[PDB]
Amino acid sequence: EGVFVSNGTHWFVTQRNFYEPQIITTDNTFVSGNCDVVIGIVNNTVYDPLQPELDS
Amino acid sequence: LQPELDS
Amino acid sequence: LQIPFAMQMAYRFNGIGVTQNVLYENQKLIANQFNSAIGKIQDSLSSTA
Ligand SMILES: *[C@@H]1O[C@H](CO)[C@@H](O[C@@H]2O[C@H](CO)[C@@H](O)[C@H](O)[C@H]2NC(C)=O)[C@H](O)[C@H]1NC(C)=O
Ligand SMILES: *[C@@H]1O[C@H](CO)[C@@H](O)[C@H](O)[C@H]1NC(C)=O
Numbered sequence: 061e062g063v064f065v066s067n068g069t070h071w072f073v074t075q076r077n078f079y080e081p082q083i084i085t086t087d088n089t090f091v092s093g094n095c096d097v098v099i100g101i102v103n104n105t106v107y108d109p110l111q112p113e114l115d116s
Numbered sequence: 117l118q119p120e121l122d123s
Numbered sequence: 124l125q126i127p128f129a130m131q132m133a134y135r136f137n138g139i140g141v142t143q144n145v146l147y148e149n150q151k152l153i154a155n156q157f158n159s160a161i162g163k164i165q166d167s168l169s170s171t172a
């Protein structure tokens with residue numbers, strides 16, 4: 061529920077009607093298939109909040 | 117998650 | 124407010140209750156079906172009064 065946006069150096073997700081940037085995460089986003097199909101897809105990290113929690 | 121991170 | 128046209132059409136797919144990836148994964152088919160469907164309007168109006 062949002063749009064991917066960049067300030068020039070970093071990538072965020074915002075709600076569409078008001079600028080409120082958040083870090084892109086596995087619970088801000090959903091997966092569908094591989095990188096080869098989508099026209100204009102970009103390479104960036106997606107953070108997974110469980111992995112440091114298992115690292116406790 | 118915190119009860120599961122007990123395991 | 125500017126937005127890329129394929130991203131505007133992904134918002135319109137969300138508005139009908141179809142998930143955005145259905146547009147981005149079928150974008151060339153959706154564009155062809157639109158371009159074809161406008162060609163039928165052109166032919167029908169060119170054909171009859
Ligand atoms: C894009 O946004 C990020 C926000 O994370 C900016 O990075 C921060 O910038 C300040 C000031 O230089 C630093 O104190 C922080 O440590 C930075 N955080 C990170 C995670 O790098 C970044 O400067 C912005 N870029 C532009 C071009 O505006
Ligand atoms: C936008 O145009 C550039 C070339 O100017 C191209 O590399 C890119 O794939 C295009 N992206 C989209 C979303 O159409």
Ligand SMILES: *[C@@H]1O[C@H](CO)[C@@H](O)[C@H](O)[C@H]1NC(C)=O
Pocket residue numbers: 101102103
């Ligand atoms: C993204 O990563 C792939 C990894 O194979 C690379 O080929 C590509 O050049 C990178 N950049 C873009 C914009 O796809």
